[PDB]
Design a protein around this ligand. Structure first.
Ligand SMILES: [Zn+2]
Ligand SMILES: [Zn+2]
Lengths: 164, 164
């Protein structure tokens, strides 16, 4: 109850103590992060970023196909040179198919979403390899791509070896 | 100049102090936030969120059209009931046309991107109004939508009144 009132109250405390007003547009680490919208992940705390360090791109499952527009802008307009892709344990995108979510939209809203692809995946590590390989194969992405699993159970980032 | 070594070292410190392993999938505030990938914005600090409070969806310019997949999953599978859309001052998406970025891709990569739409906007407040009205008009989004501008120069969230 009162989300808008609470975030505006918290913001007033943040703004009172804020001195980071001079930070420039290009990220200092020339880095873009692609990860899940998952509420339990604070990317800045997990990776030790401060304001101005890295682009942080977030979507349901941290899918690289959807991140690509954001990555091209990140690199071509704002100078980033590197991408990290982070999926996580206990991701919602493991727990349904396109058919299951289309059914839930019909059941709850009475709407047809048969032509929208929701990009769920069947295996966590396979999803990271598919995404990293996708970005390595793109002619529109420059630089090294690294894949990780974040363990929501212990706060650990686990780097994955992705062959090819 | 060793991004992967730096974030792995910082993560090892974060994991040593980590207590939050029992948090569940559904966000506690039943809230999804849509904002820019901009490096200077730590959404958790700006809004006073803790791990497990709100979904955080981020893309170049915080465009609601691209967030829609993520919002539908957030609401239908993970129980969120409300959306906040935050654009920001000094956003890169104000500073180019699709034809300007297509030129940079030709100059730097020697690639043609004439079939990709990058979704820049011409006016910051109009961009927030368009994105809020887009989500309010969608038959696949339930609940209240609020628009904000985040002022990168002063750390201030400014709520916009958006009609019809
Ligand atoms: Zn997830
Ligand atoms: Zn921006």
């Amino acid at each position: 109850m009162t989300n808008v009132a609470d975030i505006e109250a918290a913001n007033a405390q943040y703004a009172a103590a804020f001195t980071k007003g001079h930070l420039p547009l290009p990220p200092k680490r020339k880095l873009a992060v692609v990860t899940c919208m998952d509420a339990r992940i604070d990317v800045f705390s997990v990776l030790g970023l401060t304001e101005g360090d890295a682009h942080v791109i977030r979507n349901a499952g941290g899918r690289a196909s959807e991140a690509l527009r954001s990555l091209i802008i990140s690199q071509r307009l704002l100078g980033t040179e590197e991408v990290v892709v982070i999926h996580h344990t206990d991701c919602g995108m493991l727990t349904f198919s396109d058919e299951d979510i289309r059914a839930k939209i019909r059941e709850e809203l009475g709407e047809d979403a048969s032509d929208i692809k929701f990009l769920p995946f069947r295996d966590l590590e396979a999803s990271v390899r598919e995404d990293v390989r996708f970005l390595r194969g793109s002619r529109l992405v420059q630089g090294n791509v690294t894949g990780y699993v974040y363990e929501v159970e212990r706060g650990r980032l686990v780097r994955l070896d992705v062959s090819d």
